[PDB]
Structures are given as C-alpha cells and as structure tokens.
Design a protein around this ligand. Sequence first.
Ligand SMILES: N#Cc1cc(Cl)cc(Oc2cc(OCc3n[nH]c4nc(N)ccc34)ccc2Cl)c1
Lengths: 558, 404
Amino acid sequence: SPISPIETVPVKLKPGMDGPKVKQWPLTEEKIKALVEICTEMEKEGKISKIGPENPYNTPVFAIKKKDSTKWRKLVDFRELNKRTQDFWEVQLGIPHPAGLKKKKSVTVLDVGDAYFSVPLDEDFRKYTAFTIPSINNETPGIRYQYNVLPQGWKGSPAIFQSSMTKILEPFRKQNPDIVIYQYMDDLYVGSDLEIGQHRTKIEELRQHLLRWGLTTPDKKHQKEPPFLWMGYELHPDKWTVQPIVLPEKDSWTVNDIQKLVGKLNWASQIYPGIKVRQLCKLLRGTKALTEVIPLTEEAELELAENREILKEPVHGVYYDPSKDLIAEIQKQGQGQWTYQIYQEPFKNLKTGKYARMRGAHTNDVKQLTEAVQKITTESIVIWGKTPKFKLPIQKETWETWWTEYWQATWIPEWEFVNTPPLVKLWYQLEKEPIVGAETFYVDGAANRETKLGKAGYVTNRGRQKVVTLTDTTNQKTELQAIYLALQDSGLEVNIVTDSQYALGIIQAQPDQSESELVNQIIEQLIKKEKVYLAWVPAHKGIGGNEQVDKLVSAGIR
Amino acid sequence: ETVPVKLKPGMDGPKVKQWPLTEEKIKALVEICTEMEKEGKISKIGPENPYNTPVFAIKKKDSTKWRKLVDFRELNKRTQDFWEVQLGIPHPAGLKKKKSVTVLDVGDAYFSVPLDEDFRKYTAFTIPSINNETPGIRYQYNVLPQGWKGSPAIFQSSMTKILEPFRKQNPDIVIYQYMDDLYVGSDLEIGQHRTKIEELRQHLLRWGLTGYELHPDKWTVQPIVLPEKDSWTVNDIQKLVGKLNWASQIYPGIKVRQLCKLLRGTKALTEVIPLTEEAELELAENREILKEPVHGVYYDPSKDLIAEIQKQGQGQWTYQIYQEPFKNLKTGKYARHTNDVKQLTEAVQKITTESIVIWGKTPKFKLPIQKETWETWWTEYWQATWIPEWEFVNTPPLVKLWYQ
Ligand SMILES: N#Cc1cc(Cl)cc(Oc2cc(OCc3n[nH]c4nc(N)ccc34)ccc2Cl)c1
C-alpha cells in the first residue's frame, strides 16, 4: 500500500514527561506466532520497522482471534503513550447536517483505504511507539519494532490524517472551485454540477491526484451508489431522511426499551413534525434498573400512539437553495413543548425540530417562545450561515407589550404573526397603580429555621385578619402562602403589600406555569381577578401594617 | 529582535471555542486573513497546535469596511503578569480632568513588530465553515496581534519615541495608550484641540500609523433622585421609605424615622396624608445628602471593577460601577430604530470607555440579558477593538426603581 510522500507533523510528548516504558506480558506460543506473521508482513509494507534494545520505550501488544473466523489481529494498547502525547486540535467541530447540503447534479463517495497506514509518522516520535513481540516464555530477548505510519489507537492519528488530507486536497481545490469536497473522517464526498461526462472524468483526475500522494480510493463499480446511508440519514438525490425507524410493540417496557425508544423518536424529530417525547421521558425520572419494567402511563400511551401515527407513512426533507430565503415556523404543542419547521418554499421542509427546555423555575409562553426562537436562530447560522425569517403564533402587540415592560433585554429577529392556535398570550397583568376602593391586604410570612414551622397571614385595612399555620416550610414558602391567602379572601380587586422581594419577583414576571403547585395556585387566582395591585416594603421597619402582620406571624415562630 | 513572553506559571494557552459565524462574516474574514498571510502577519498552522481563540468580524464605527476582531480575553488573563506587573503602562490621573479627550486607533503599529517565536502558538484562531462542510482554516500570529494586552506592553518604548516630539511641544496634553487606542486630552478650545489632533496624526503617520470626542470633565452624577410632590399617598411614602431605606447603608447618613410615623396602622394605599415638616428636613437633608459624592469610597487598584446595568424602558438604561456592592465609584445613564441588544451594546461600550479614562481598566459587566441572545447578537453592533468581561444576571425588582 502506498505510504504518502507527504510532509510530517512534528509531534511532542507532554511537557516534563517521557515516553512509555510498559512491560510486555508473556504470551501464548500461538499468539507469538500470530504476531510474528502480522509484523513481518507490516514491515514488508513499510508500516513498521525493527529496532534494537537501546530504545528504552515499550507499549504492550496483544493478539485477538476471531468470532466466526480463523484470522488473527494485533492489538496495541496505546493508553500510556496517549496519556503522555501532547493534545492536538479538535478534528471536526460538528457534523454536516443534510438540510444544509446544496443540491448537486452528481455526487460520488470516495473512501480512502488503510487511511492511517497511508500516512508517515514524525521521524523523531517513532521511538515512543516501540513494542515487543515477546519470545517463547521467559528466555530470549523479544523482537522490537516501532511505527513509521500513524498507528491505530494513538491520540494524534485522526488529527494528523485529516491535516494531511487537507494539505493534499488544497492544490486540486484551487484549480476546481466549482467542485465540492466534503472531508469526513476517512471519506471524501465529491459533488459537482457537470454532466456525468466531465464528472466521471473529474472524479478520475481527483483519484489520480490522490495516488500521487499515497492515497488509494475506490474506482467505479466499487464506488457506492445512491441512496447514501450515512450517519443515520438517507441521502437521495433530491431529498433526505432519517434511516428506518421501527417502534417496538411490547407487553412490558423496561427502562432500557424506553431509552432506546425516546432516542429513536428524538432522531426522527429532525424530519417528522410533531414528535412528542415529554410523557415518555417523565417515565425515565428517578428511574430504577435498566431491566426494571415500567407500566406506561395513560399520557405516555397517548403520546406513544400519536407518535406511531406520525411515523406511519414516510416523510423526507429537501436540500438547500442558497438564493431563496429561510422561513421558520413554530407552534406551541402544550406542556412546555414546542415544534418548528424550516422551509424555503411553503411546506417543503428542509428540516424540523422541537424545543422543551425549562429555562428557570417559573416561566411563561412568551419567554419560552423567545428561547425557542434563539435556539432555532443559532441552529440556522450553524447549518446555513444566516438566520431565518420567523412566523410565530404571537400577536405583534402581545410581544411589544411584553418586551417593552420586561426587565431583561430581548430581541427577536425579523418575524411575522401567523394565526395558528394555540396563540401565545399573557394571562394577567398587574395594575401599575393602587386600585381605589379596593381592600388593602398587608401580608406576611415567617418560619422557624429550627422547627421548620411557619405561620402565614394578612391584616387588611377593612379590619379583616387571618393567620394559618404551616408545618415543614420556609420563609419563601410562607411568604407565597400569605399572598395566596390574601388572594383567596379578597374578591375581584385587591391591593397587596408584601415585604417579600422574592414573591414580588416571581409575580412581576407574569409566570403562567411553575414547578411549585403553590405558585400555580397563586396563578389560578391572579387570572380570576379583575385587577390586582402588588407592592413591596422593607421588613422589620415598623411600617404601618407590616409590623402588624409581622407580630401575628412572629408569635409562635419567633 | 523579539521580547520573550512567559505564560503565568502553571497556566496553559487558551482553548476557547469559536462561536458560529454567518456566511458573510466568514467570507469577510477569509479575505482579510488571505491578505494578512500574503503580508506575512499570520501563517497557517497544523493539528499540533491545540490552542484557540475566538475571532469575529465587525463593521467598526460608522464604516462599511469589515474589520477582523480577535477575542484575547482568555490569552490576556493568562499573560496578565507580563502586561501588567512586568511591562505595565501607567494610567494618568489627569486624563479625566481634561475638557476634551479624543480616542485614536493605533493598532496598525503592532504589525511591524515580530512576535517571539515561542509565544505564537498561543495566538491560534480558526475561521469556521458552514454546516461543518470543511475543516476550519487555522492560523497563528507572526506579529504583535491587535487585541492582546502584551502588544502595547511591548510596543511601549517605540510609542514613547513616536510621541516625544509632540509631548515636548505640548506639555499640557495628556496621551494615554490603552490597548489598540490612544487617548489624547487637552484643555484647548475645541478648534485648537481638533487642530492638535491632526498635528499628532501627522507624527503618527511618519511611522506608519494611519477621531471621536469625549468630555470627561463634564461627566456627572446620577444621584438617587427622590420625588418632589404635592399631596402624598401611603403608596408614595411606602415607596419613599423603601427607596430611602436602601439609599441609606449605601449613603452614609440617611434618615427616615420622621417618615415612618406617618405610616401607622393599616390604612388603604390610596389614602392621602398631610406631611409633618420635620419629615421635610429629612427629605431636604437626604436630598441635599444625595446630591453629593459618597464619602469613604475610593478606587482600590488591586481590585476588579464591576458594572451593573438596568433596563429602565423607553431606550433608557442605568448603571453603576463599583468594586464592593453599594460602594459606587460612579453611576450614570445611557439613552438611545434600536432594539434592546443594540442599546445594551452601546451602553456597554460607553461605560467601558469611561472606565478606561477614569481608571485605565475595563469593568466586568453584569448584563440583564440571556447569554445566547447576547452571544448571537453583540457582534452585530460592537465597534470597539476591545471586549470587556461579562456575565449574565437577572436585575432584582427593587434595584431598578431605586435607580430610576
Ligand atoms: N454519504 C454521503 C455524503 C455525506 C455528505 Cl455530509 C455529503 C455528501 O456529498 C454531497 C451530498 C450533497 O447533497 C445534496 C445532493 N445533491 N446530489 C445528491 N445526490 C445524492 N445521491 C445524494 C445527495 C445529493 C451535495 C454535495 C455533496 Cl458532496 C455525501
């Protein structure tokens, strides 16, 4: 096999460290024989070279037989060398997404053979790779070899190979700007817009260019044919999709079956719109053993059935046209679940996806919708280099009211309202000014850190009063209870004063959903009112009303 | 001849990840870097360089030309000993006193100075590609790189020579170099100041280096402001003791006892009240008290500065700079087709530049925004050649009002 003429990547061990010196474990005679055969063959091919006992480095070797077969393989345990080798730059920083692939008349898949073996290893680094085929039991010095090419399993290989294949392809990429070459691991994806003619031909000058460099590739007849199965996808010439998704019908479901299930659904979610996974994931919470069986919940069952239906019939995605624009559409699916589709031409999707996220404890659809827009935006830049134009289910006034008054800076790129229910809205607004002729509840909460006992109450100004006891609470929990209380006993309009910045904060953000039922109970209330005003005061500052709810709740607590 | 740089003992180079860029910014960077390489400023590197610094493209300040911006925030933290307490550049106390300060870009100076061969690898940066189509284009610097604090540290002696004639001739002009910029302050009438700048650009120009006006001595307070009103409500008093109460502890000598007493028993919020005049002595004592500096608060050179920003609405933003909470060294506001990100980027830059003028250092910002949003968007509006440190926060309900 050719061993590339290419220049060498200088390599180094990690500062203050010297090459490995690991002892070879005595081997069986059959194993020693197997290796001697494999090694003499590799040496014949240039791949390895014999050395003396002056080189003091060593990495263990082993010989693994076959499952079904009668061949032998040599395994080198490069763990120690790896742990001493300098760090390299990261190979690839992401993988291409098919939805980002521009359509080309012809594409051919070329896989380099014996990739690592086709590339030389830094001459001064070769020593550190020394290994020994031990002799029959104790007696006799072993046979010592060292690598000349990039060894399988060593830290720098994937990186060095890729750099080499970058340097080698350059020249040809100059005199061939119109041709697309994807470099993925030890594969090359070559596509052009010519007629098979200058293509089947151009792909031949390419191979030739590679051979001058020690790199062998397949030839027509061996060259893969479309639809390319790659990385879980099916690349046809005018569409793409995920590879066959089969959902197991099953009596009992174990944790392990659901995990695999959730996984396939998530993968299908990139092209099948509407896939939901929430109810199925809930079942994976706190989970027991991998083999433990889990009785599907009714919601989990309805989620499942809905998924099989989406999956009955196939769906595909289109490739990318750089001239047209990107449109992203999002929809609220429910329980914090969102779904989107990206297209350039109405309803011919490049891709799909979903957003669940719980960015916080208490939140709302308006914040959620804008988290989803960010996630999609980032994603677009990654796949296409530009942002999409959005069509969101939120009225342009809801957004404006929300953005404008909210404390945090936000900013949705270019968008437009599209009337697809459920529509995103705020379910309540707090007055900006005290409601005249409405009762003013002055609320308070307190808890004994020692007994974890609390009291929550209010003293209004219409003479009313109240105090409830709570058992394993906190100051936070009692302060929210006191507000809830005040909201239960007050009717359509209320002014509420608290000295809790915490409950204030939560409430002023218009949450519509929370991890705390107490918080959800308050929400249900806030939505029922006609008008609620809410204000804050310092505590332990003898403030009219404050020092009064403060004395009530303090008693029996502190 | 190069000066040797040694990372602080124990630290390794930066392995910061490159955020994603849009096709247009990528193409712009590919051109820029293709030219720098021809000129020999940077050279393509190998897999054997594990280091990495983010790179961006900005359109500068009122410009149509794409400029490359390298983020050496991490590399600067790890070289802090060399550029700060080894090759330090003294910050002039007089600068903030001047009536006019003009900022000039001096970053093209560094390109004529080679970088110590053993340090180059740390300046690695990558031009990503779209959809991970190809591997990114990797490069490293051969010359003093703009954005790195070690560049002016090194270039110090040469800047000194370049400026000596201009300095000898205009003894009352203050010139301060912070990173890629020159800050030039004078007490000259504006036409004479602008004229002296032009003169200085001519000197700069004979050495290869090829502005915008601040008025530091006019930088004033954003005193906590208490309302002046006729016929108060419990609500307004409550709010008043609230604001008043927080303003204390930060403001040495505030009082409210007079005010509390008016708030007695549980009376409706919408209930007007007559004010007792002694409460008015506090109002006027605090008011007169508030319209002053803090007393006790001094900048400590060894500590980091912090900046907090609050969104007030209507294109209005407030800020405070301090090293210890409530111990504000300065406070101010920034006012604005601008969305919040744009306005926030503009405030960040304005605060940073005042911070450079007053202390010779940038603050670490607490930004009331979502990391991702901020991250995808800032570059769109950034025009400075530096980048301060930041972190994300959620403004506390109270804080904002107390600063309105
Ligand atoms: N296996 C595999 C594989 C993996 C990747 Cl990430 C890229 C690739 O090549 C292309 C695939 C392209 O997709 C669009 C397209 N145009 N023509 C095609 N013909 C096919 N048989 C499959 C896809 C395409 C375009 C250019 C190219 Cl080069 C092949």
